[PDB]
Symmetry: T
Subunit: 158 residues, 12 copies
């Protein structure tokens, strides 16, 4: 029944609730990333196929980071196939084996919903815990950037 020295047992628990969501969000994300890492096919196959691994090994990186943070706060992280399917507010990636274009486009949107939920979770944190914030921010930086990669693959002449 402990907690970080400097946080009201209430603010603390509200942050937890926030991350627990982020965590399930990442677990879906990184599992989905690997999903496309497998079912992508096209002329510029390798390019993308390989481009995903890092973003994956990275998102999973944000999982241990967030969870290990939750436990630190006092609450107990949940990362079983169950907990995830519950906390999420979407339908798992609908694409099977398809073209590069297909996935990237679909992925574009997945990140939209991930960057958005994050941003909100950040702004909401500036009043709760600043630490758990610099943390979430950092992720945004790479999440948003990676998205760019996805997107740069779909543009026209400008």
């Amino acid at each position: 029944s402990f907690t970080i020295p400097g946080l009201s047992d209430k603010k603390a628990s509200d942050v937890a609730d926030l991350l627990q969501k982020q965590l399930s969000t990442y677990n879906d994300l990184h599992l989905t990333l690997k999903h496309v890492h497998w079912n992508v096919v096209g002329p510029n196959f390798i390019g993308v196929h390989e481009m995903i691994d890092p973003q994956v090994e990275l998102v999973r990186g944000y999982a241990d980071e967030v969870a290990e943070r939750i436990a630190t706060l006092g609450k107990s992280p949940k990362g079983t196939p169950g907990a995830i399917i519950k906390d999420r507010t979407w339908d798992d990636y609908s694409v099977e084996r398809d073209t590069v274009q297909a996935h990237l486009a679909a992925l574009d949107l997945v990140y939209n919903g991930v960057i958005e939920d994050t941003r909100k979770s950040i702004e909401k944190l500036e009043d709760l815990d600043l630490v758990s914030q610099d943390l979430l921010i950092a992720h945004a930086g790479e999440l948003e950037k990676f998205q760019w990669f996805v997107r740069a693959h779909l543009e026209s002449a400008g």
Copy 2:
């Protein structure tokens, strides 16, 4: 509509169906592993906590391996939070934050069901595809071994 040169489009598809199951099995496993990696607590905490990461980075290693194998065969791997919750025949890890003992014991059983399902999938493969077999075997070796680690933490004087 291709396939490995030397496999009947039927034997090939039957192997696929087999791995697709294994894959979902691993995804649960490795996600669950990380789950305990987070909610374990006790006197000999670190010991276990750290002991899990490798088995994890390893099981996820068997995921890319199996899936990338399925696609090679012709069928299309499915590794979304959805596909997994469906192909599985159990209830995701029921333990929240608990003692070392607790998890390890619980994990003991999880591996039972994983090693068993595997063994059977191996024997069943000796008639289908020998390659997709040496593959599944290798895993058993480490899966089984790791279990031992878990178990060695629960024994008595002999």
Copy 3:
């Protein structure tokens, strides 16, 4: 008689005074960490013994970081056995050779006083220098986390 281009010679000096405290705090901490790294004994000895080195090589890491920051500001860091025993507001670790439990519990508290003093120093910095803040924050993240490690070694069934 210089200073960072953008800081009033007063705000600058007030930040210095703040870090100079943090610095002595770390020096005690990391010297103390190594202290227990030596006098710990018990059944799960190695676990802890080894678990400490990183947190140590890390806190000493925050020493060079903070001090090199102070000098940058204009004031002069003080890190002799003297300066530390003075800036501190506690009694150096009272434990000699004792059980794992003993130290970890005692250490739990030491970190309380370190995370607390830090948190306050952060909030107090948002008006002074934002840079010297992202800096202090970052540390909190790992300081707080490590504490968790210590703590996870002391819990019950929930």
Copy 4:
């Protein structure tokens, strides 16, 4: 006039004859791989160009492996430009500088004939030498997989 303790001087010699074929097969393969590594051109050039080196450094890896195995058996490996052009049952890669598509498609077939000849050589080995089998199998795993890479570059919407 020696041989592995446990193999009839006849079974031994029959395995040799088998590998000696595999070896020349690899030598053609890896030399051919590098061939396209050079004459590929197109929009997604780099992707493929670079994708080939590893499969090459790998096939050449299977050369030393096989040959050093043959010598172990008692017979004498032959790997001169001559020996290869003789043991082979095909016409060296007919493509000069051409598109990505071109080579990959052409390569698809080359691997067909390599995976096929291998598979048969495996099944034929289960009665001769089990060791020289796990060996050939392993290769199949990567050979077959790489082919997939080639192929994934040629598919449609499903």
Copy 5:
């Protein structure tokens, strides 16, 4: 015509304009750094000569960082010798081959103008995009620190 999910197409474009400036600032800086890396001469030559490379390989590091961030936002980074000479509000380093003292002193000032422009750009960002802020801050930390190095080479007895 896209943008980060959570930023008004206006706030987004205003941040871009801000970085685009920073970027040209860095390009001048790092090109200038290397400039002195070449024309420095004196008794304690090596010391400085070598001290610069890291700060260089680092500033160029902040270039890719900032620009790849701008593109992510939607606008298009400009980093040609042209774009830079335009966005800047100073006269390129006036020193040719000269003493250590000479450059360092001159460099002192260059950093003044870089840290200042940065600080302002940070404060101005707290209302626009927090992500693009933690980013700029981080740089300040090292920029400011390095300056210290330069400066520590010019002091008296206190």
Copy 6:
């Protein structure tokens, strides 16, 4: 007022003048390379995007090399945004965010003017300084090669 033991103070100064040009040429090149590294977009994005970094970290490599050579000769290298915009005889890259094709084609030409100016500078050096030649040659090898990469991305069926 020194110089390499074996070079007439005149030949020496004429070589300097030659490199000083090369240097500014590289600085434009490498800055431009990074420019496209940022504004490229298309289906085979990653491929190219990543393909550029090495050639960049390499050209910047030829910068330190050439300049540090000039200083060795006696003259003083100039590598400020200024010096470059002056010594050059072209208009900085005209392409903003555009397709892969676009840039590569445009880049094709940029290298034309760089390999040409180089070649000439080599032939002209065989009478001046042989050392400063093997140096320039080496670069040609990689410069020319990289161009090939660019080009291989633009070809037809032969």
Copy 7:
């Protein structure tokens, strides 16, 4: 009183008995290898002397591997100087300091008895446990290969 999920407590114990023998076999082998690593002398000394270390660091590698496997099965590995001298069916290496030729020839035979005992143990395992087989096979591959090395040092013109 546990065992791998899928093995009859009898088959399991029969495999154990098999490995326990292998293990003592390796321990003798690797201890013996080092023995010659020390007492070899001749014109081509270094060659051999150094050639042995890897095969050694490797056989000891098969020790931990086998034993850790036995424990996994349920029985208890025995690897004391005692257990070994008992399970073995030969007389420890009779050679003291002697020529290169001497040892290698003698070693030739030692490997005969090791590869033979292994082969049999493999064939005998195809009915018991397939895992504990791929394991023993793999070793054969390198054991047999190394022998070749030994042997290649003793041949004539063909």
Copy 8:
């Protein structure tokens, strides 16, 4: 019939006799170490299990060291399962699979007999060969230290 230039053919042979003993002592030790590395079981299993490998890879390190030293002296090292069982004056480790406590305690004693025999061999060497002494000393340092590790696992409140 040679010897180190500076040692009486008698002193030399007496040192040899001394090391030859040490060597067999180590071989038992390191073989025994691995023995427990396998049969240890308990709650804090991993801790110890892993703690042993280094001390092992280390003692085996002192084997090559000592033996290669003996050969240097002129006599011929003996390191076969035989030689060891003879030179030793004890009964090989009596513990099978048992608790952590069990082994460590038992191991405690084993090291007693190893550090003791060593110490004496050192003092006895100060008159014979100083080199072969700094050598034996060094080992003591780590041997004794490791023992401490074992021991720290068995203590009470002081």
Copy 9:
């Protein structure tokens, strides 16, 4: 229908023709090297066996180098088992499994014809392309050197 900016479409094609020969020469060489790497036997076996790999991993290094150079020029490299057996003007290595002496001597000659053909190709290049020269030269340095190694194995008292 392109070419290096600075080479007459004729000089360029004449250089190509020259390398294309060198390339086939290397392919034979490195394939032959590995050939002896396998069939060498004798007292000082290891010495040579291992001495070859580097020279091999090196000549294959000169293959990619030369070919990738040819393509750069405009012509299309040919490196199939076919192309090689044609461009060559000798009979592939006639030695099967034989002594160390045998091969080395035979190899001595092979290098004679490779160094000679090279030297000529160099002198012939000083008028064509200087770049494609420094390249060929470099190789000679190591080719010639390695030969020495071969040779040093065959000498008498002087």
Copy 10:
């Protein structure tokens, strides 16, 4: 209530008392080293600044070494800010931010008092424990050496 097998519980305790002093001596030293690492300023700043880190990471290296040695003996190491300020017989470094010359000179003396106290502690040990001696000696070698570095910065023409 244990101790190294071969040391009288009295000699053992007398050695402890000796090291415990050394330890506090090092802790001051290394903390002081870092102190100057921060407050040094001058023309040849970097030179020294960087020259200190290694000696620091080294002295701290001698801390863990000594302490871990004390515990091995039986007594309990003390390394809190307290214990140190007590065991020492001097006044912590009196220099704040000053010139290079200043510190180095001051440091010269500090090492005098450290090398002296050490030397004496060595001679005094030759009768107590030889192991704890080779240990202290080794340090002297580097301590004394580093001093030289300090000193070489203060000399005249001879």
Copy 11:
């Protein structure tokens, strides 16, 4: 009585004579370099002291290179303290322990005589052996460059 295939037994022997001189030149140089590496003293001591090692480990690098080249040619390299003192045409470094300035100035001249003798040996080689030329050139590049380092330590305001 052999020689590189393409060199007249006379041209070959004349090149040898040339290198044999270079070699003794380097041996003096690198031995001398280390000489100053030891006897340098001053305020900016470390800077230089450390600056020399690389140039040393590099010149010794040119020794093995040249000699191993001579042997390749047919003649026999001579690198004993004797051979060197003979082939040289100067008096070994006259400086004992002195200031930084002292040595560097003195060294300046030493390199003059080394770069000069080299340059001449290069020009003289363009008619003999081109290979043994690119080799000597390369060295010049770094020799000359390093000299610059030495020199940059002695200049004034321009």
Copy 12:
């Protein structure tokens, strides 16, 4: 006019005189080692050729070690081709290009005179400086050992 705190200005100078000799001894040694590294020829060439480099890079290692020690003491190391030819009491290696046997035998003796001179210098040091002793001892260990290597190449059947 300084010296290690604890050494009489006389004892100190007598040690210096001792090392200064050792140093010249090493310089001859390591220069000579490389000498044979070049002129060795025979059937088992490579073996030895390569066996020497390490002992060389090692002896040169003992050079910097000893010299940097002398300077520490107060006197000034001398390591020019001159100083060496003077301090030595032998005739530089008399062997030109010869057989493996030749050199090794010759080298055998060289080491005799080096190990002997060393041993004596050690015994003589036990009364002067213990530090400068552990130092010299250490070397003996490897010097003596390496000799063994040389020697093991010359023995008979026992």
